[PDB]
From TrEMBL, chain A:
Record-given protein name: DNA-directed RNA polymerase subunit beta'
GO biological process: DNA-templated transcription
GO function terms (MF aspect): DNA binding; DNA-directed RNA polymerase activity; magnesium ion binding; zinc ion binding
Subunit structure: The RNAP catalytic core consists of 2 alpha, 1 beta, 1 beta' and 1 omega subunit. When a sigma factor is associated with the core the holoenzyme is formed, which can initiate transcription.
List of residues binding Mg(2+): 208, 210, 212
First and last residues shown, out of full length: 253 to 804 of 1407
Organism: Escherichia coli
Keywords for this protein: Acetylation, Coiled coil, DNA-directed RNA polymerase, Magnesium, Metal-binding, Nucleotidyltransferase, Stress response, Transcription, Transferase, Zinc
Length: 552, 66, 1316
RNA sequence: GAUGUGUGCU
DNA sequence: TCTGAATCTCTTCCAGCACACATCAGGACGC
DNA sequence: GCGTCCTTCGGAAGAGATTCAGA
């Protein structure tokens, strides 16, 4: 390629062919002049090594270099390896009619809808705009339509809404680990420069909203659009291929909203009153005449399909809350009521969606999933389930547990220094006792944080399941587990080095009270372990899936 | 193993595209092999309907036509 | 006492412990290293002098002429840093050395000399570092990152485990030189010690022993002790050492002096050795069968015939005993070979030894180094002399020699560069000693074995390589030159030195582009410690242990700051108080602790001397006397921590802040965040963009002032004084009379930097922060820079956040931002970017910059002038024309798609030979007028100051004040005054004014030459027009937003003012975050920062309220004193009594925006103090308040957290990342779309992407993504025509990339083809 | 077009 | 002294996408 | 400014070539 100026590109193959032709011509000239046998033998050696370097460079003892002392590539380095033609330009290619932008939430969408920026769709669906502009006669030739599009006239914006109507696109993330990495959505043209994504598929995508880029793709031909509509559509991809569990699981806001709604405590604005259905429960809660955690006896009409596809009616009077009564309004006709009459966590609603799919089908399941989305977001916004520094409560007995563990490890000191156990055995027992102490502190804190609440039912004090915010977002399973919250209050535990070995000394402090200047240095080991484990040992796990997809 | 069984696949293009391209291509050139383009990666490289999903009916028609 | 820059907005501090050592100059490593590299230093100690005396003098191959070095000197730079940045040329200085050539008289190799000729010859041209720690190499600014490489010396690696598949630990000894060849010793599974130099192949070390001219006698005597067998009547009595019999089994009946000591089969316990020492016996009996397991030391020859009986190092049997007994060899010497104490590795290596003598060993070495070449004795001897015994091909540095000697427990620390025989022998002894079991290996992650090669030494190495190349060139030239006519420039070629230096500073792994988008990023980029580059390891062949943190990193390297990705742990960052040793090692300050009193003398302890002592910990309470209030203080003894006593300690940490780097120290409440979310927090604080109106952070740390004054963007006042004239482009100080010089004092002028392009297209802008007639002290800020505020690093804005879910618009990590945020114009950031339109005189004719473009109407040419350049100040929109360039048959530069802006600066560079256009001469005239006006103004200012000093002098010694005005200001020098020293001073000032006029005229003439000169460019371009746009990037949904605690996120919606939740006072909330980002990622410190910011803004709101209705100073002072004394035992101790009732009104005005709170890294606030500060206002103690829904208008049925968290804005803007691609450009070697965003390229449906389509079975769409849409040529156009014809149908051909594969396979000997 | 450095998400 | 088992030695592999910047292309020697 | 030319440093595993031993 002629670069900027008089120089040329330093293409490897050209230099190798130049060297080979040099050796061949010089050898031919020497053979024509009847050179001494040692000279022509040496030149034959030079020709052989030049041809060797041209065919497969680096297989000999030394790989030749042209500039910067860098081993140049031959005819084999571009056929073999990670940068060869097979893996770089054959099994995967750069693709036109594509785009890429940072994604935002826009939770007003549905499972069959995505959000494209208004400017990306004009560059993506440009030939479609050209075709319809030529069809309607608003333009005359291709270049006139090109100029009209580049000038972004008002008519082009009107006709864009026509091509973009029911033409599904391929939303795609950069690491496509599994089958659900590419899902097809219909586009909804919006302003801005961000690709809005429906949060119900963000768990499947593993696409957090912390600055990641997704890639769009436009099915051009008819069959591609029909495949995206019938196969790769996100509506028909609500069951992961890994197992029978659903993959559209609400998470991290909807679970919290549902769990805070479908819960009961013994007091309210109105508690013992009776209602004739979900509608009056909604009327009570909107007006504020009854709390969302009341314990009332509404009259509901749940359906059953004991017949061969016919729903038989029944009406009962069950003792439920106001929140569960409100939630029953969106449940499709046909599921038993004994699915929301509890504290709906994440696994609970996952099982609920699974049984909805198993009983009713696909369309009620997707409609109900969207309704769960809406009624989780609304009552999570109204909840105000915040987090303060007064929510992580330190148990008053963790230091007794660390004292007992310190006494036992001091006993272990005398155990190994005398000779009863050795250094490796001491290391195996010290981790044992530290893990036992960590497991005791975690359980003690969890009990103290889940049961320590006092409330009166209009009389003496009674105990209920706690309303601490951290407990809500650790029990609902929206985002959290025992590990993170356990490290937020009580014992952080013992961390591991990148090689997999565990530190002999667990740091004894929690993030709610603080860390020393030395316990932080010790936790640095685990913090670096996690990152240098991800970035440097996901390679030998992507290799596994590569050579697994290869073999099957 | 999966690597050993993948490197000894009958269609030499798959093994050549996967790993040890020199050691597989040399073996295929020596043996004078003839690929049938039966699997999925072979048709991906060639650029046809892979005999996997919607193109499976077309591949059946093309196979039974001969 | 506090200065005026501090008594303007004093930050409340929560530090418990006091600091006795202030933070040093942060970027003090680069300027110190380069100073050591460039300073004129005698005795050949540092810098260019050392390299010159290590290379020069030179004499030819008995050419009788010597070219000896004298001295070097640097001239002034041709262009200053601003001109170098504008043009694109290096900010360097010519290197002039006054070399001399001397040749002796014939028949006198050491006698008299013939002639000497000397001149300052110009060779090379080396870059200079600016006053802010960076170079200017090609207009862009580079920073040379220091390298953390393995220290030269001897290293005893282990290679434990995974070798030999049996767990047999080997032992390999490495001698890494500073410059030379490696000398790897190692063992073998068969317990043989094999040497291996330069990783060629193994061979026994006895070969190099004989290469050192050591006979097998000498080796066996050296490595082993002796046991004597004496001929007597019979039975061959044994000379016995009592200690030699420690811990083995008696193969026979041990006895001495007749009596039996140890019975047969019984082990020799320590009591037996002790009792044998007590008896004092040495001669014992032994059966002759025990001699079978013995080896003879030296060779034995017969005393009768002179024939060798048994040579050196062979076993002894009964026949050999019989032969030696009859011969008469009375003294028999044998090797003391044990199994665990002294193994016979040397004997085994001699058994496997192929060579026998020095000559054969040298020939074998020559064969190993250069295989296949016919060797002679002289060539082998010269090669082995050159490898390890020559200073011209092998040189351990002084630090290498020091490490070498201290690793072998020697007393001497100095020595020669090359090794010696005793050095190699000692290395062998130490390796064998480690093999036996005494001692242990040394890990290569202990930081006392890893140096820091800074900029100066890296430049030294490259300059030395260039000097070696020139050395070879002049050595070749001086042997074939005609003497008496060669000036000392004809042999010295200036090309190689300059070429090597430019190659290093411009194209290398460690000449990094400066990450300069805000002061923190650049000041921590200069303070980087990269383990990569030449002489170091690579990310691929990097073990997982090197990434891990060593216990010796404490105080020298930040444990919690390293970039994510492939290079993690290899790009370690320097700590705050860490320094560099004279040997290049890392060492950290410590306070020396006496018997019971903590002294204030600071000692810097290296990474090795730390383990010998026991060091106390910074968070240890002291009581006014250097005494520990506790009898048991926590400490660390040897890379591990345990409880200690107050009597055993001898060192204590300077401060808690010394552990973390400068970047990671700016995070408040860092001791509550997990280090996992502290690493990312530090990185995203490094990547912040400066906002429009910079705003101080409320919950600070107190180090922000140090970073702001150190990074160099702030115009720190050199000399204190009074601001005589402030302006948006300059600041003038009338300095105090105490600090004025006798002569040339005058005054000083600070020229500020206006809106100019930065290295990351952000906006650097120095703006004044001082007023007229304001007394400024020494070393205080004068000009607010980018993302600073009154000398305080302000990387973002303080935003009123609320942790609550809001309709899922903050679902996963998103951030919901009010319309009021952009209404207040807070996060809109300036983005200066340049566009260059070169005019290449390519083939078919040169191209013009004319103002008329064919086939384009006047709509796009309205902004253009009649010359071809766009007007300065035009509000250009995307797609418009900036400069009209047309090639001989339309290639004019245009603004890129979807970017607005305003042209603010156009610079035109033309060839010397292409005359001008009218716009170029307009710019030239503007530049001349501006330069003349600037020089005239600055000289007018300094001469006003000079005559002010004159008038101040004249007031003593016969003054008449009235006649000064009526007498013209020209002859103010000879006025009424006697001939005392004041008249001499007046004459000196007259002389300096004359010199000022002379430098005015000469520098104006020089500036005229510098602007009017040609300014040559690259070969093949006529003229260059650079257009500098100015983009104002507003805030919009899609760009990253992140706090200091690593809580990142993307804006999802901009709600109006009314929709966001508001408290009972109606104040809207700016940001509605997500609560669940607190627990799962353990950054709890953000909640505490939110609470402290809420308290700070409450105090600020109370101050604002008390200032709104004007109350007397008493109430404001009382409230502010209550606020500043609220801390339990803080060392702030500020008293408002010393404030003079005027400088406290300014303080109260500056606090109405919110009281700034400091929070040391590991000495931060406690929640009791936070709640007390909350109670000081009228805020709830819980930290949570009550907000009502913005839309619904009803109560939120839970109290929620509301506060002011310092919310940064990252420069990962969405419009810098938004991209789409229709049909467009295509690659050349393969017919595929291009890759990237600058090129109009599409995304990559990679190898992993195709499996996600085969998995669904969607075959047709896959076939479009790799056959008809990208790859093929005919179908690519056919499908486009079908799409714009109404017919959606695809007709696949063959991918062109498969034909490329077929052709590249057929290029080999392989025949691939397609059948029928 | 290729190398070198830095960076984002996994 | 032939022939399996153990060891030595040579080769292959190491995630995906994206963005920004830089250099670089024979550079040495004769004209 | 033109113009033509002759360093080492990973490590986990598999395979193919040697050495050993051993009966
Ligand atoms: C005598 C002086 C200490 C004074 C007591 C010794 C101790 C360590 C030596 C330096 C180090 O080797 C690093 C470096 C090696 C490069 O080659 C360039 C020179 C450098 C600076 C050396 C010059 C000098 O020799 C030093 C300072
Ligand atoms: Mg992510």
């Amino acid at each position: 390629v002629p670069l900027d100026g008089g120089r040329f590109a330093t293409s490897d193959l050209n230099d190798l062919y130049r060297r080979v032709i040099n050796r061949n011509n010089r050898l031919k000239r020497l053979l024509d002049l009847a050179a001494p046998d040692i000279i022509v033998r040496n030149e034959k050696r030079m020709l052989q090594e030049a041809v060797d370097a041209l065919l497969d460079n680096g297989r000999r003892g030394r790989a030749i270099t042209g500039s910067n002392k860098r081993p140049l590539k031959s005819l084999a380095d571009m056929i073999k390896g990670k940068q060869g033609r097979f893996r770089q330009n054959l099994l995967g290619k750069r693709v036109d009619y594509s785009g890429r932008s940072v994604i935002t939430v826009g939770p007003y969408l549905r499972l069959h809808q995505c959000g494209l920026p208004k400017k990306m769709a004009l560059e993506l669906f440009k030939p479609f705009i050209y075709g319809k502009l030529e069809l309607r006669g608003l333009a005359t030739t291709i270049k006139a339509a090109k100029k009209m599009v580049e000038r972004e006239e008002a008519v082009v914006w009107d006709i864009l809404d026509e091509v973009i109507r029911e033409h599904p696109v391929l939303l795609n993330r950069a690491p496509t680990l599994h089958r659900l990495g590419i899902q097809a959505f219909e586009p909804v043209l919006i302003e801005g420069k961000a690709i809005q994504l429906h949060p119900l598929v963000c768990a499947a995508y593993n696409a957090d909203f912390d600055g990641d880029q997704m890639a769009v793709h436009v099915p051009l031909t008819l069959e591609a659009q029909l495949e995206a509509r019938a196969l790769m559509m996100s509506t028909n991809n609500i069951l992961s291929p890994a197992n029978g569990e659903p993959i559209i699981v609400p998470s991290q806001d909807v679970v919290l909203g549902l769990y805070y709604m479908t819960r009961d405590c013994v007091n309210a604005k109105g508690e013992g009153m009776v209602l004739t259905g979900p509608k009056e429960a909604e009327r009570l809660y909107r007006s504020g005449l009854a709390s969302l955690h009341a314990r009332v006896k509404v009259r509901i009409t749940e359906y059953e399909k004991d017949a061969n596809g016919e729903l038989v009616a029944k009406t009962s009077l069950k003792d439920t809350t106001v929140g569960r009564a409100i939630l029953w309004m969106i449940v499709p006709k046909g599921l038993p009521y004994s699915i929301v009459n509890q504290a709906l966590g994440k696994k609970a609603i996952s099982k609920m969606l699974n049984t909805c799919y198993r009983i009713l089908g696909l369309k009620p399941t997707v409609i109900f999933a969207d309704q769960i989305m809406y009624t989780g977001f609304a009552y999570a916004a109204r909840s105000g389930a915040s987090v303060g520094i007064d929510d992580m409560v330190i148990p008053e007995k963790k230091h007794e547990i660390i004292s007992e563990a310190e006494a036992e490890v001091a006993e272990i000191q005398e155990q190994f220094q005398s000779g009863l156990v050795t250094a490796g055995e001491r290391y195996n027992k010290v981790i044992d006792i530290w893990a036992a102490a960590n497991d005791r502190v975690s359980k003690a804190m969890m009990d103290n944080l889940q049961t320590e609440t006092v409330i009166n039912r209009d009389g003496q004090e009674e105990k209920q399941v706690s309303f601490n915010s951290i407990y809500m977002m650790a029990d609902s399973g929206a985002r959290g587990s025992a590990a993170q919250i356990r490290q937020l209050a009580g014992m952080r535990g013992l961390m591991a080095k990148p090689d997999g070995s565990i530190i002999e000394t667990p740091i004894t402090a929690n993030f709610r009270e603080g860390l020393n200047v030395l316990q932080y240095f010790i936790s640095t080991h685990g913090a670096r372990k996690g990152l240098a484990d991800t970035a440097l040992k996901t390679a030998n796990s992507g290799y596994l899936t590569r050579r697994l997809v290869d073999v099957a | 193993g999966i690597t050993k069984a993948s490197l000894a696949t009958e269609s030499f293009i798959s093994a050549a595209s996967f790993q040890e391209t020199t050691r597989v291509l040399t073996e295929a050139a020596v043996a004078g092999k003839r690929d049938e383009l039966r699997g999925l990666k072979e048709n991906v490289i060639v650029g046809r309907l892979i005999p996997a999903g919607t193109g499976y009916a077309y591949h059946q028609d093309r196979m039974r036509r001969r | 006492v506090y200065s005026y820059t501090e008594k303007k907005r004093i930050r409340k501090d929560f530090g418990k412990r006091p600091q006795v050592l202030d933070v040093p100059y942060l970027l003090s490593i680069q300027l110190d290293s380069f100073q050591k590299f460039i300073e004129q230093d005698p005795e050949g100690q540092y810098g260019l002098e050392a390299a010159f005396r290590s290379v020069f003098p030179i004499q030819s191959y008995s050419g009788n002429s010597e070219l000896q070095y004298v001295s070097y000197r640097l001239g002034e730079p041709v262009f200053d840093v601003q001109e170098c940045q504008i043009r694109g040329v290096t900010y360097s200085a010519p290197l002039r050395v006054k070399l001399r050539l001397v040749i002796y008289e014939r028949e006198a190799p050491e006698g008299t000399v013939k002639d000497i000729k000397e001149q300052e010859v110009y060779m090379g041209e080396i870059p200079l570092m600016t006053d802010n720690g960076t170079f200017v190499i090609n207009g862009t600014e580079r920073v040379i990152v220091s390298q953390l490489h393995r220290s030269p010396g001897v290293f005893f690696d282990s290679d434990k485990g995974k070798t030999h598949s049996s767990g047999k630990v080997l032992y390999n000894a490495r001698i890494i030189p500073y410059r030379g060849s490696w000398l790897d010793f190692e063992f073998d599974p068969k317990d043989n010690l094999f040497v291996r130099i330069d990783r060629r192949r193994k061979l026994p070390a006895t070969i190099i022993l004989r290469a050192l001219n050591y006979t097998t006698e000498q080796i066996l005597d050296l490595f082993f002790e002796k046991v004597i067998f004496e001929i007597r009547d019979n039975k061959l009595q044994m000379e016995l050492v009592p200690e030699r019999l420690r811990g083995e089994t008696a193969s026979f009946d041990i006895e001495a002096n007749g009596k039996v000591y140890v019975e047969k089969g019984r082990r020799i316990t320590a009591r037996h050795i002790r009792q044998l020492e007590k008896d004092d016996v040495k001669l014992i009996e032994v059966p002759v069968e025990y001699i079978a397991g013995k080896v003879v030391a030296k060779d034995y020859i017969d005393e009768s015939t002179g024939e060798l009986i048994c040579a050196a190092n062979m076993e002894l049997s009964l026949d050999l005993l019989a032969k030696l007994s009859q011969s008469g060899h009375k003294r028999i010497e044998t090797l003391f070979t044990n199994d665990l104490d002294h193994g016979p590795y040397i004997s085994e290596t001699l058994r496997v030894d192929p060579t026998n003598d020095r000559l054969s060993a040298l020939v074998e070495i020559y064969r190993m180094m250069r295989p296949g070449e016919p060797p002679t004795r002289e060539a082998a001897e010269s090669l082995f002399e050159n490898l390890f015994f020559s200073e011209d091909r092998y040189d351990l540095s002084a630090v290498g020699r020091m490490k070498f000697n201290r690793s072998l427990l020697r007393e001497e620390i100095e020595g020669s560069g090359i090794l010696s025989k005793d050095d190699i022998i000692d290395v062998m002894k130490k390796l064998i000693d480690i093999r036996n079991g005494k001692g242990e290996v040394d890990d290569i992650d202990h930081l006392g074995n890893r140096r820091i090669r800074s900029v100066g030494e890296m430049a030294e190495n490259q300059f030395r390589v260039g000097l070696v190349r020139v050395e070879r060139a002049v050595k070749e030239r001086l042997s074939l030159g005609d003497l008496d006519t060669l000036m000392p420039q004809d042999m010295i070629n200036a090309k190689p030195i300059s070429a090597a230096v430019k190659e290093f500073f411009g194209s290398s792994q460690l000449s990094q582009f400066m990450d300069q988008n805000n002061p923190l990023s650049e000041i921590t980029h200069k303070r980087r410690i990269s383990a990569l580059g030449p002489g170091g390891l690579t990310r691929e062949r990097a073990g997982f242990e090197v990434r891990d943190v060593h216990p010796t990193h404490y105080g020298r390297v930040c444990p919690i700051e390293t970039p994510e990705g492939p290079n993690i742990g290899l790009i370690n960052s320097l700590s705050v108080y860490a320094q560099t040793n004279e040997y290049g090692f890392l060492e950290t300050p410590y306070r020396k602790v006496t018997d019971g009193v903590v002294t204030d003398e600071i000692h810097y302890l290296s990474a090795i001397e730390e383990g010998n002592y026991v060091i106390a910990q910074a968070n240890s309470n002291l009581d006014e006397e250097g005494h520990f209030v506790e009898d048991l203080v926590t400490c660390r003894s040897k890379g591990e921590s345990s409880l200690f006593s107050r009597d055993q300690v001898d060192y204590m940490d300077v401060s808690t802040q010394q552990v973390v780097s400068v970047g990671a120290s700016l995070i408040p409440f860092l001791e509550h965040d997990d280090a996992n979310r502290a690493l990312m927090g530090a990185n995203m604080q490094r990547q912040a963009v400066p906002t429009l109106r910079a705003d101080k952070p409320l919950v600070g740390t107190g180090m922000e002032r140090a970073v702001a004054v150190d990074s160099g963007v702030t115009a720190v006042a050199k000399r204190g004084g009074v601001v005589q004239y402030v302006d948006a482009s300059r600041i003038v100080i009338k300095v105090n009379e105490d600090e004025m010089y006798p002569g040339e004092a005058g005054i000083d002028i600070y020229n500020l930097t206006k809106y100019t392009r930065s290295n990351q297209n952000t906006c650097i802008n120095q703006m004044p922060c001082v007023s007229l007639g304001e007394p400024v002290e020494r070393g205080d800020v004068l000009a607010d820079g980018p993302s600073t505020d009154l000398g305080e690093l302000a990387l973002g804005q303080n935003m009123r956040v609320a942790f609550m879910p809001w309709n899922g618009y903050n679902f996963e990590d998103s951030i919901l931002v009010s319309e009021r945020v952009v209404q207040e114009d807070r996060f809109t950031t300036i983005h200066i970017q340049e566009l260059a339109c070169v005019s290449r005189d390519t083939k078919l004719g040169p191209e013009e910059i004319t103002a008329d473009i064919p086939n384009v109407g006047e709509a796009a040419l309205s902004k253009l002038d009649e010359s071809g350049i766009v007007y300065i100040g035009a509000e250009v929109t995307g797609g418009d024309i900036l400069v009209g360039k047309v090639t001989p048959k339309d290639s004019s530069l245009r603004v890129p798609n979807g970017v607005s802006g305003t042209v603010i600066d156009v610079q035109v560079f033309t060839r010397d030979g292409v005359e001008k256009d009218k716009r170029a001469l307009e710019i030239e005239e503007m530049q001349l007028k501006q330069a003349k006006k600037d020089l005239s103004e600055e000289l007018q200012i300094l001469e006003a100051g000079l005559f002010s000093r004159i008038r101040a002098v004249l007031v003593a010694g016969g003054v008449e004040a009235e006649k000064l005005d009526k007498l013209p200001r020209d002859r103010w020098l000879e006025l009424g005054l006697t001939d005392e020293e004041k008249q001499n001073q007046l004459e000196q000032l007259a002389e300096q004014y004359d010199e000022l006029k002379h430098e005015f005229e000469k520098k104006l003439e020089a500036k005229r030459r510098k602007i009017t000169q040609g300014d040559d460019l690259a070969p093949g371009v006529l003229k260059i027009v650079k257009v500098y746009l100015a983009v104002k990037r507003r805030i919009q949904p899609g760009d990253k937003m992140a706090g200091r605690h690593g809580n990142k996120g993307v804006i999802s919606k901009i709600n109006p003012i009314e929709d966001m939740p508001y408290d009972e006072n109606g104040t809207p909330v700016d940001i509605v975050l997500n609560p669940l980002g607190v627990p799962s990622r353990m950054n709890i410190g953000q909640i505490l920062e939110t609470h402290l910011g809420m308290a700070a803004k409450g105090i600020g709101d109370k101050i604002n309220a008390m200032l709104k209705q004007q109350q007397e100073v008493a109430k404001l002072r009382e409230f502010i004193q209550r606020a500043y004394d609220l801390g339990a035992d803080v060392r702030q101790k500020v008293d408002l009594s010393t404030f003079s009732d005027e400088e406290v009104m300014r303080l109260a005005e500056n606090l109405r925006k919110g009281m700034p709170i400091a929070t040391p890294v590991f000495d931060g606030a406690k929640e009791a103090e936070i709640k007390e500060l909350l109670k000081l206002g009228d805020l709830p103690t819980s930290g949570q308040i009550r907000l009502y829904d913005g839309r619904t208008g009803e109560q939120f049925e839970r109290p929620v957290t509301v506060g002011y968290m310092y919310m940064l804005k990252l420069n990962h803007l969405v419009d810098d990342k938004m991209h789409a691609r229709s049909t467009g450009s295509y690659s050349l070697v393969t017919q595929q779309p291009l890759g990237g965003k600058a090129q109009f390229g599409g995304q990559r449906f990679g190898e992993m992407e195709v499996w996600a389509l085969e998995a669904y079975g969607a075959a047709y769409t896959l076939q479009e993504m790799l056959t008809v849409k990208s790859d093929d040529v005919n179908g690519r156009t056919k499908m486009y025509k079908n799409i714009v014809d109404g017919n959606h149908q695809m007709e696949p051909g063959m991918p062109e990339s498969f034909n490329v594969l077929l052709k590249e396979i057929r290029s080999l000997g392989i025949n691939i083809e397609l059948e029928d």
